[PDB]
């Protein structure tokens, strides 16, 4: 018997009344959620930002009872592009409930940050798990010099990264958990051939985010582009004694 909230989509209907759509995010007739803008043929375009949030607010703690949320999310996406350098990536993310798309964020900032404050942790309130396909050091100075999965804490510069291969049109299955007893954020990603990716980072979520949050996804393209297609998503949060 716990206080908990849980939800799941195996498809995205064109009428999803519990989802908040931001910027260019929209749902295709095929019921795949498309985060970034496409042209009249469904091809990817430049300078686009898209995000979704579930409308239900997630309670991260309740100081009253020393309870902290233990959370768990699963999702699958694929990316596609005619380009040899496809940009910029998709992120699962957690932020205050009134979070909106920052100015200047269509590009390497992933729809998550303003460029005047993107490396200033004091100005942000965001945990993100990114899948980052574009790392050119000329514009994505913060990035490691390869493709990567990263854990972002109030910064576009990841606290931890692991090397990762983008695969044109292939579904990545992802599992993210937060264990509040160990304060650990744990990420496991897998392609359909079993090719596997792991990444963890210790951060106390109560020190970085407010009591009530919203959860969802962000994606962007700058001068380079791709489609960012979310296929499925489930989420559970459970308040647990810590």
Ligand X SMILES: OC[C@H]1O[C@H](OC[C@H]2O[C@H](O)[C@@H](O)[C@@H](O[C@H]3O[C@H](CO)[C@@H](O)[C@H](O)[C@@H]3O)[C@@H]2O)[C@@H](O)[C@@H](O)[C@@H]1O
Smallest gap from residue 136 Cβ to ligand X (A): 4
Residues within window 97-156 making contact with ligand X, judged by CB under 6 A? 107-108, 134, 136, 138-140
Half-sphere exposure of 62 (CA within 13 A, CB side): 14
Partner interacting with residue 180 (select from a copy of itself, ligand X, Mn ion, none; CB below 5-8 Å by kind): none
As a whole number of angstroms, the distance between CA 185 and CA 205 comes to 9
As a whole number of angstroms, the distance between CA 88 and CA 231 comes to 18
Residue 66 binds a copy of itself (CB under 8 A): no
Choosing from 42, 45, 65, 100, the residue that interacts with a copy of itself (CB under 8 A) is 65
Q: How far apart are the first and last CA of the chain?
A: 16
As a whole number of angstroms, the distance between CA 110 and CA 128 comes to 10
DSSP structure class, residue 65: G
Partner interacting with residue 204 (select from ligand X, Ca ion, a copy of itself, none; CB below 5-8 Å by kind): none
64/138 with CB nearer Ca ion: 138
Q: Looking at beta carbons, which residue is closest to ligand X? A: 222
Contacts of 145 (CB under 8 A, 6+ apart): 135, 137
Contacts of 201 (CB under 8 A, 6+ apart): 151, 153, 159, 160, 184, 185
Instruction: Supply 189's token pair.
Output: 């990603």
Choosing from 20, 32, 56, 119, the residue that interacts with a copy of itself (CB under 8 A) is 56
Partner interacting with residue 13 (select from Mn ion, a copy of itself, Ca ion, none; CB below 5-8 Å by kind): a copy of itself
Smallest gap from residue 171 Cβ to a copy of itself (A): 14
Residue 165 binds a copy of itself (CB under 8 A): no
Half-sphere exposure of 6 (CA within 13 A, CB side): 9
Smallest gap from residue 195 Cβ to Mn ion (A): 20
Residues within window 70-89 making contact with ligand X, judged by CB under 6 A? 87-88
180/222 with CB nearer ligand X: 222
As a whole number of angstroms, the distance between CA 44 and CA 82 comes to 8
1/84 with CB nearer a copy of itself: 1
Contact string 142-161 vs Ca ion (x = CB under 5 A): -x------------------
Judge whether 45 and 15 are in contact, CB under 8 Å.
no
Judge whether 32 and 25 are in contact, CB under 8 Å.
no
Partner interacting with residue 87 (select from Ca ion, ligand X, Mn ion, none; CB below 5-8 Å by kind): ligand X
Judge whether 174 and 183 are in contact, CB under 8 Å.
no
Chain residues binding ligand X by CB under 6 A are 87-88, 107-108, 134, 136, 138-140, 221-224
């Amino acid at each position: 018997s716990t206080d908990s909230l849980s939800f799941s989509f195996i498809n995205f209907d064109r009428d999803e009344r519990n989802l908040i759509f931001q910027g260019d995010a929209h749902t295709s007739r095929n019921n795949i959620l498309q985060l970034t803008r496409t042209d009249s043929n469904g091809a990817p375009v430049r300078s686009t930002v898209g995000r979704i949030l579930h409308s239900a607010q997630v309670r991260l703690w309740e100081k009253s009872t020393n309870r902290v949320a233990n959370l768990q999310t699963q999702f699958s996406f694929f990316l596609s592009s005619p380009l040899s350098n496809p940009a910029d990536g998709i992120a699962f993310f957690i932020a205050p409930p009134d979070t909106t798309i920052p100015s200047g964020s269509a590009g390497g900032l992933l729809g998550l940050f303003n460029p005047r404050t993107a490396l200033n942790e004091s100005a942000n309130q965001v945990l993100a798990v990114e899948f980052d396909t574009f790392f050119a050091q000329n514009s994505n100075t913060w990035d490691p010099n390869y493709q990567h999965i990263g854990i972002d804490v109030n910064s576009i510069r990841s606290s931890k990264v692991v090397r990762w291969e983008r695969r044109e049109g292939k579904t990545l299955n992802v599992l993210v958990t937060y264990n509040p007893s160990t304060r650990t954020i744990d990420v496991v990603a897998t392609y359909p051939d079993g090719q596997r990716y792991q990444l963890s980072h210790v951060v106390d979520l109560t020190t970085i985010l407010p009591e009530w949050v919203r959860v969802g996804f962000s994606a962007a393209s700058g001068e380079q582009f791709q489609t960012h297609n979310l296929e499925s998503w489930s989420f559970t949060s459970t308040l647990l004694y810590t």
